[PDB]
């Protein structure tokens, strides 16, 4: 089959995962399905409030492409928002792990079991998407966007600096900060400090990011490799940067094309970090079975062991690709990503195509094709094949008055923003 026909397939299929594959109870994503039906934890209906952040976007994907209908898409959405309102919230943020069936909180490890404001803020950038999407819809769907718009301003994002000029990541009604994770640069969560800046009842000054993110300004950095340079200081992953999963996250609904401030150029760095991947796994150092330019993409998943943060380097690179590295790059690499998408498709499905799209991860080394799913890593490859597309989800975030008023804020430049003429003098 062809690239073009391919695509389209992938990106249903993988569209399944939200649809489908949702716990019926919430609407929201499963942490995890195992097409087997075995869960070693048996929590087949846990359900990852980020994940079903990227899940909403898939959904708006999925009206948009006609894989479902507006008024299946706005059942469910209605559901999830239903949901969402009567979940544990811990300072208007939700936890990282809800029971799908009753809407409290599961302990994400014991000291984590209240807000988490970074999945909180993937929720919030999918959410935001719906809101503008329905915004001009009839009665119940400006209904909808209303609920969504209430559930964003009631995220209390200035509660989690804890009077500091940073962001915490957790907060607990009883650990209180003992889980004591300041969130600092360059890391997957820039977002959360965009839409906290963006947030009109419960914002931050833009010295939470200069000096909590930003770290005042030691998160520039020069990581060269392959010819290819990174600005920005990747945590713990200073020769080739992290796992490629940060160069998605933050950017689904946030454009990274022209988006630039004081500390780096978004598009070169997020390109440059894919591109450092992928040559990675085409010198393969390591020599692991299938490497090359038509399989490649490293980044946390699924692993041979249990679960790891796949990456490159001698000491992150298990022999283990994980589909969602390269499909969710598909933006920025998009020859590169179909190249290794056609070779999976035509020459592996027997083997890492399911149900709902390409499996989590799979060694050729090993002979380790899982049958299994993650939500954190099928969301991203609907999304970004589909921003590739069309950009539905850029042109529906970067629409937002609050995230041109919070990137503002924060001095970023992005073609999205509309700029204010001055004549000379007044
Ligand atoms: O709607 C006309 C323009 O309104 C604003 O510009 C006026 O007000 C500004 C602030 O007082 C002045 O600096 C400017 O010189 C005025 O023309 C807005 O900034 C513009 O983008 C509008 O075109």
Known sequence: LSADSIFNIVEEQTFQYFWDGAEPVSG???????????YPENDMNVVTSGGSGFGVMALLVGIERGYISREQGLERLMKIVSFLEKADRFHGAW???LYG?????????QKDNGGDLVETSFMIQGLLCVRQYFANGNEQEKALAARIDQLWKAVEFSWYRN????????WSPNYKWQMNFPVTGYNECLIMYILAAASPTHGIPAEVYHEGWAKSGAIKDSINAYGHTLKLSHNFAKEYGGPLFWSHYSYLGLDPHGLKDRYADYWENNLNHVLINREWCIQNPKHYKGYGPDSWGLTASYSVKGYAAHA???????G???????LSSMPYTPEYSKQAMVHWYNDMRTKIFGKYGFYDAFSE???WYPQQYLAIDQGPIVVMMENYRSGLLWKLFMSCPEVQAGLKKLDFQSPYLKLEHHHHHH
């Open 312 to 318: 490159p380097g001698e000491n992150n690179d298990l």
């Open 320 to 326: 283990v690709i994980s589909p969602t590295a390269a």
């Open 365 to 367: 080394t090993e002979n």
């Open 101 to 109: 069936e009753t809407g409290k909180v599961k302990p994400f490890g």
């Open 28 to 38: 929201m994503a499963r942490e995890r399905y195992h097409v087997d039906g075995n």
């Open 163 to 170: 009077g500091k000029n940073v962001l915490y990541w957790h």
């Open 95 to 97: 936890p990282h792990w």
